[PDB]
Write a protein that binds this ligand. Structure first.
Ligand SMILES: Cc1cc2nc3c(=O)[nH]c(=O)nc-3n(C[C@H](O)[C@H](O)[C@H](O)COP(=O)(O)O)c2cc1C
Ligand code: SF4
Ligand code: SF4
Ligand code: SF4
Ligand code: FES
Ligand code: FES
Ligand SMILES: [Zn+2]
Lengths: 192, 62, 434, 230, 119, 93
């Protein structure tokens, strides 16, 4: 469910107040320091990624306005950036965002086999969170030489901007992927 | 009956149920005897009204 | 030699620690020959570096093929108030290629040295490295290496003990293939959508922040320091005329134990396939097809992949150039139409939809080839596909449109009879069942 | 020849006037004056969809392509600056097949709602399609569609019939002075809108009606009232 | 002045004293093409057009309601002026407004935007 | 006779002062002459042996309200014997 319009929802609406955390404020200043003062708009990508990490994996309309105020641009110029790049979710995602098999360098080896197991182990369609806001399934892009056709990808949004982690796992198996899901259920992380 | 103008007569037809993001409306079942084909993106929760016929299409799923 | 340009001695390789057998931080790089009296290397001035790069004949990697000396010489010699920048295209998109993430995972200090050398050879006040968004661990490791170099006085004000100043910043994308383009890179780094700009305003005159800049591949700058230290003449020995050097090959596909070794430039394809990465699965007898380099180039069939040299010009004469140098072989056990259809879908997915021919033409290509994947099309649709690809090619803003038209043309030119076979057999089935 | 539309060329520097061959007829134009403007001076009218003389130059829609003797690829005449001694070619098979090829792509996803388009009689898309286009039509598969989002009481929008020429975006960003309209999305399926419920609240906000070539943005008070010919 | 041709034209004499306007119609804003420019027309002001009180049809009593539009187009201002002068009409020439071509460059989109000086 | 043969012969045979303007095309051979030489030109075309124009098809008229000679009368002619069609037009006021 990838849309280019809001249709204000009680979960995300412009009137809600969104502010950067005090720990993240130093990171915000460090990010802004990397570019000239007049060209503050350049920090839009790092600022948006940091805001997505802090919230818990999704980017509401209020965070976009907060970033726009931080870099002092019109909020539409941040909506365009957020919509263009396939890394800002803009839709609520559980603490963990599972990513599913990739493109044709990998689909030659049989990428599209491991897709249904993740869905029916949790009983949620793609882009839909489980009953509790922990797991979700989305699409990914291969990093490069994808020799192991079944790969999975996780994003640690549970801790927030501090414990954020983006790991890629190779040689995934239908029972192995269930093992990783169960391992992430309790809280401990799998080895990559 | 003739007391019902098409304005208030086309609104009594229930919206069509269809799966998918878009649907093609041709008017009559024969394409040559209908209107030009009109693909409408029925993504909003309100039914999407064809501009030629006035028929309303809504998404059964979700 | 000249009779065969195949095989390194494992001591002439310049990308040591490529397999991650040792520490990639400052200590390991220092013990491996990095930051070796670089102040002496940079004190000869900008002109000497440019002349040495011109002498070495270092063809620009990343698929461009433009000589690095000519590209570096394009930067202005005098600063008219506008400082000059340097952007390293570390965005390793176009999957099937994993050389850049391996370079930045194991040799970050080599990249920092290369960018500093480039910023000495081009009058750049600061340099930006644009890491692909998916490379989070790689970005963190390279940030740690960058701050290690900063703590050692290797960067910042008074870099390497000389009067030259260099600031190296880190920028990361958010998952867009088009961001890897030369200009969409600058557009994204400027804080807006990554959509390429028109060419006549060249980056040498108006690039990053409206200031002159030069975009070079991370692989091309990583070999910059070792070329100067080991000597430009040594580098020119590996390969053939005007296109000599060493190229990284990310072999993959239907082969056993695919390697990512670095070898000579004009490596024969047969030797490369059958020497390092075992052999093609099922033996060389099947060898249905092979893509030399990245997927943005036309396909080469079985007949003409023999006795072919993995050079820019040698491959270009075959109407299939060399891009990122990551071959994908296909055995006869798999069909070629499905792979090209999925490739066309990938190109449709990542197109930034700016100019009309790429925004609509890629979708049309995907639709037509999805239709013919099951053969549900007329026989004349092949000429229609050829005309559509011709219309797309050459009328776009950037080279992604050509990069999406080329695979279809390659499939049509070399593997046409499969299309007629599928269409005819589906027609026979249709007439047989009512 | 005389300039098309009676356009006046202001030579701020009499010494600097590069001479170019638009189609074999040499004309003199000052520094700048991108290839499109040079042809405009020489009385040659070139198709255009994204180029407005009042806004910033953008290179999309690839419709003003021409052929230059020293150019491998056809160049975007609306963006490439003039250079001394160019041999431009407009009525050439390359520069023509370019135009039909581009306009086929423009029309492949356009909706079939001409009889109900409020800009039926004055649409640049169909007027140029009649002249600079192929009559056959090849596309047969399913087109795309975009839902219509309300903005303003006086700007009726049907974004299904919107070629992404970004002319409205540039107008709102530069001339109007209020940044509410932008381009959203990537690839085939990018939309243009405010991304929120806001409406265009600007004093000179009704000029997006005329500046948009196709009938995507049309005035709401004049909805279906009359055709241009009457 | 010099209404001899007007006298011999045979048209009702009361229509020889009409005030007319001579102009070149400008390019429409809704279109970008300039294929309808450079042609001059005489504009008889056919203001009076009431509404038929049977079906709402637009009635008129002015013989010159659409002459200047449907026909009678001149290739130059001098021809139209001479025509109105020959037919003895009190013409009033309105000069057209022409666009002024200015130096426009693609690179002007991407300016240095100065130096981040304190302010 | 062939259309180009009429062109060549008539242009060579005719007195030079009679024809101000003359045109050759597939649409039709045209002789634009002055207003006072029209009678003489028609008489020559009617009686000459090679160009025996015996029947006059029609006398047309075109109004050009943008030139000094506003009207233009067109004489369509036909040579039954030689199976040719010539057109003579002049300017009026
Ligand atoms: C659509 C497109 C995508 C590209 N992606 C990459 C990329 O991911 N990595 C890369 O190094 N070059 C990529 N390039 C080539 C760039 O132009 C190149 O990075 C830049 O020109 C520097 O080339 P050089 O190393 O020869 O100097 C891409 C080019 C195009 C047209
Ligand atoms: S060709 Fe495709 S990728 Fe390149 S600018 Fe145009 S739309 Fe974008
Ligand atoms: S915008 Fe033009 S082409 Fe499109 S429907 Fe309206 S009149 Fe037809
Ligand atoms: S809405 Fe109109 S002006 Fe804006 S991009 Fe679409 S066609 Fe162009
Ligand atoms: S992209 Fe999925 S296996 Fe590589
Ligand atoms: S009008 Fe020039 S590229 Fe669109
Ligand atoms: Zn309908």
């Amino acid at each position: 469910t990838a849309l280019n319009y809001h249709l204000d929802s009680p979960d995300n609406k412009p009137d809600l107040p969104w502010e950067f955390s005090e720990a993240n404020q130093s990171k915000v200043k460090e990010i802004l320091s990397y570019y000239p003062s007049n060209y503050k708009q350049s920090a839009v990508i790092p600022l948006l990624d940091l805001a997505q990490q802090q919230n818990g994996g999704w980017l509401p309309v209020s965070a976009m306005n907060a970033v726009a105020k931080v870099i002092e641009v019109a909020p539409i110029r941040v909506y365009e950036v957020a919509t263009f790049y396939s890394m800002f979710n803009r839709a609520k995602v559980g603490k963990y965002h599972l990513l599913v098999c990739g493109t044709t360098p990998c689909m030659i080896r049989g990428s599209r086999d491991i897709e249904s197991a993740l869905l029916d182990h949790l009983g949620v369609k793609r882009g839909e969170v489980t009953k509790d806001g922990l797991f979700s399934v989305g699409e990914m892009e291969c990093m490069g030489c994808c020799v192991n056709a079944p790969m999975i990808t996780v994003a640690d949004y549970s801790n927030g901007s501090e414990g954020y982690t983006y790991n890629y796992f190779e040689d995934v198996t239908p029972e192995k992927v269930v093992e990783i899901v169960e391992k992430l259920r309790k809280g401990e992380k799998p080895p990559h | 009956r003739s007391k019902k103008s098409p304005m208030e007569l086309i609104s009594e037809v229930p919206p069509i149920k269809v799966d998918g993001r878009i649907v093609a409306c041709e008017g009559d079942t024969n394409p040559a005897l209908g209107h030009p084909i009109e693909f409408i993106c029925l993504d909003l929760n309100e039914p999407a009204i064809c501009k030629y016929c006035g028929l309303r299409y809504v998404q059964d799923h979700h | 030699e000249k009779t065969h340009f195949g095989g390194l001695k494992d001591e002439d390789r310049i990308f040591t620690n490529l397999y991650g057998l040792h520490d990639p931080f400052l200590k390991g790089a220092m013990k491996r020959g990095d930051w070796h009296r670089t102040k002496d290397l940079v004190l000869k001035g900008t002109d000497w570096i440019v002349n040495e790069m011109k002498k070495s004949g270092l063809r620009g990697r990343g698929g461009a093929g433009f000589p690095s000396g000519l590209k570096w010489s394009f930067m202005p010699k005098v600063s008219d108030g506008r400082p000059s920048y340097l952007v390293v295209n570390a965005d390793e998109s176009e999957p099937g290629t994993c050389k850049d993430r391996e370079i930045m995972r194991h040799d970050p200090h080599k990249l920092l040295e290369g960018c500093l050398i480039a910023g000495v050879g081009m009058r750049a006040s600061a340099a930006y490295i644009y890491i692909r968004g998916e490379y989070v661990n790689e970005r963190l490791n390279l940030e740690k290496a960058r701050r290690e170099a900063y703590a050692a006085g290797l960067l910042g004000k008074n870099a390497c003990g000389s009067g030259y100043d260099f600031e190296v910043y880190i920028h990361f994308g958010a998952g867009a293939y088009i961001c890897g383009e030369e200009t969409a890179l600058l557009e994204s780094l400027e804080g807006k959508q990554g959509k390429p700009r028109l060419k006549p305003p060249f980056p040498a005159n108006a690039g990053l922040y409206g200031c002159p800049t030069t975009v070079t591949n991370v692989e091309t700058v990583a070999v910059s320091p070792t070329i100067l230290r080991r000597g430009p003449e040594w580098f020119s020995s590996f390969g053939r005329k005007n296109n000599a050097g060493t190229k990284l090959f990310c072999i993959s596909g239907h082969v056993n134990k695919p390697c990512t070794v670095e070898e000579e430039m004009s490596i024969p394809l047969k030797e490369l396939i059958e020497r390092h990465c075992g052999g093609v699965r099922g033996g060389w007898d099947n060898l249905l097809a092979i893509i030399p380099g990245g997927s943005s180039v036309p396909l080469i069939p079985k007949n003409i992949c023999e006795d072919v040299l993995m050079d820019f010009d040698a491959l270009k004469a075959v109407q299939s150039g060399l891009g990122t140098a990551a071959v994908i072989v296909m055995d006869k056990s798999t069909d070629v139409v499905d792979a090209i259809a999925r490739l066309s879908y990938f190109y449709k997915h990542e197109s930034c939809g700016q100019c009309t021919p790429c925004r609509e033409g890629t979708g049309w290509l995907w639709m037509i080839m999805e239709r013919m994947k099951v053969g549900n099309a007329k026989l004349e649709e092949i000429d229609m596909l050829q005309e559509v690809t011709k219309q797309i090619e050459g009328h776009t803003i950037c080279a992604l449109g050509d990069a999406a038209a080329w695979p279809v043309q390659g499939l049509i030119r070399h593997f046409r009879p499969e299309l007629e076979r599928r269409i005819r057999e589906r027609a026979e089935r249709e007439l047989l069942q009512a | 020849r005389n300039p098309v539309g009676g356009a006046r060329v202001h030579f701020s520097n009499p010494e600097d006037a590069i001479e170019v061959f638009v189609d074999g007829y040499a004309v003199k134009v000052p520094k700048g004056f991108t290839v499109l403007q040079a042809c405009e001076v020489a009385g040659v009218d070139i198709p255009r969809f994204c180029y407005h003389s009042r806004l910033s130059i953008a290179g999309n829609c690839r419709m003003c392509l021409v052929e230059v003797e020293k150019s491998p690829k056809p160049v975007a005449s609306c963006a490439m600056p003039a250079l001394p001694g160019m041999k431009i070619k407009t009525d050439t098979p390359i520069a023509k097949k370019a135009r039909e090829g581009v306009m086929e792509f423009l029309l492949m996803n356009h909706p079939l709602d001409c009889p109900i388009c409020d800009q039926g009689g004055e649409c640049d898309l169909q007027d140029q399609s009649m002249a600079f286009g192929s009559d056959r039509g090849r596309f047969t598969e399913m087109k795309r569609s975009v839902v219509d989002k309300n903005l303003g009481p006086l700007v009726k929008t049907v974004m299904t019939r919107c070629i992404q020429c970004t002319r409205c975006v540039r107008f709102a960003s530069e001339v109007a002075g209020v940044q509410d309209l932008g381009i959203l999305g990537r690839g085939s399926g990018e939309e243009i809108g405010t991304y929120v419920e806001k409406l265009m609240t600007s004093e000179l906000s009704g000029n997006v009606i005329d500046i948009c070539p196709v009938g995507a943005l049309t005035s709401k008070p004049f909805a279906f009232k009359a055709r241009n010919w009457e | 002045k010099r209404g001899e041709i007007g006298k011999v034209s045979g048209i009702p004499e009361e229509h020889l004293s009409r005030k007319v306007i001579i102009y070149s119609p400008a390019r429409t804003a809704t279109q970008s093409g300039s294929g309808k420019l450079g042609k001059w027309k005489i504009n008889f002001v056919s203001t009076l057009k009431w509404e038929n009180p049977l079906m709402g049809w637009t009635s008129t009593g002015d013989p010159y309601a659409n002459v200047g539009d449907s026909a009678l187009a001149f290739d130059s201002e001098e021809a139209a002026k001479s025509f109105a002068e020959r037919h003895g009409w009190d013409y009033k020439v309105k000069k057209p407004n022409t666009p002024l071509l200015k130096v426009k460059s693609y690179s002007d989109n991407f300016k240095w935007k100065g130096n981040p000086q304190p302010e | 006779m062939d259309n180009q043969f009429i062109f060549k012969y008539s242009w060579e045979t005719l007195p030079k002062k009679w024809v101000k303007k003359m045109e050759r095309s597939e649409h039709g051979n045209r002789f634009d002459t002055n207003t006072d030489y029209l009678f003489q030109l028609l008489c020559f075309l009617k009686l000459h042996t090679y160009t025996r124009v015996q029947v006059l098809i029609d006398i047309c008229g075109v109004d050009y309200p943008s030139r000094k000679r506003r009207f233009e009368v067109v004489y369509n002619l036909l040579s039954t014997r030689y199976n040719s069609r010539i057109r003579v037009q002049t300017s009026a006021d």
